[PDB]
Design a protein around this ligand. Structure first.
Ligand code: A1I76
Ligand code: K
Length: 127
């Protein structure tokens, strides 16, 4: 029922890059999803106490959210685009695992995921 530590957004010994694909993931992908009318539940880790979701972190062992992704991108946490793409996919998958079809939160995730998929389709070739 309590909250875990959030995911890592800083790890100095993890090697880093700032690639054109990672820049696109910040400037295009994250910014598009972040501004969306359905972004708000996803802009920070799930607070299972405040939301009265005592089983959330029993079920979800790889939590992820756009607040974490935003910090990771702004703090150049990643080596490659795939790591960041995986974080977005983890976020959506967690929502689908925890909840049930037709829930509002699932519809919200689906709308964000649609936009994510459109933007990933247009991922630039690495320079
Ligand atoms: C995110 C999320 N993933 N599963 C659930 S059930 C309730 C929520 C939610 C709704 C509004 C604000 C914050 C979280 N979430
Ligand atoms: K489910």
């Amino acid at each position: 029922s309590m909250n875990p530590p959030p995911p890592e957004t800083s790890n100095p010994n993890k090697p880093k890059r700032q690639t054109n694909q990672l820049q696109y993931l910040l400037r295009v992908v994250l910014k598009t999803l972040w501004k969306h009318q359905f972004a708000w539940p996803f802009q920070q880790p799930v607070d299972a106490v405040k939301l009265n979701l005592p089983d959330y972190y029993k079920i979800i062992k790889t939590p992820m959210d756009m607040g974490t992704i935003k910090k990771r991108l702004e703090n150049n946490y990643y080596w490659n685009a795939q790591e960041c793409i995986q974080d977005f996919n983890t976020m959506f998958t967690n929502c689908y695992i925890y909840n049930k079809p037709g829930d509002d939160i699932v519809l919200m995730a689906e709308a964000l995921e649609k936009l994510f998929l459109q933007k990933i389709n247009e991922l630039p070739t690495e320079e």
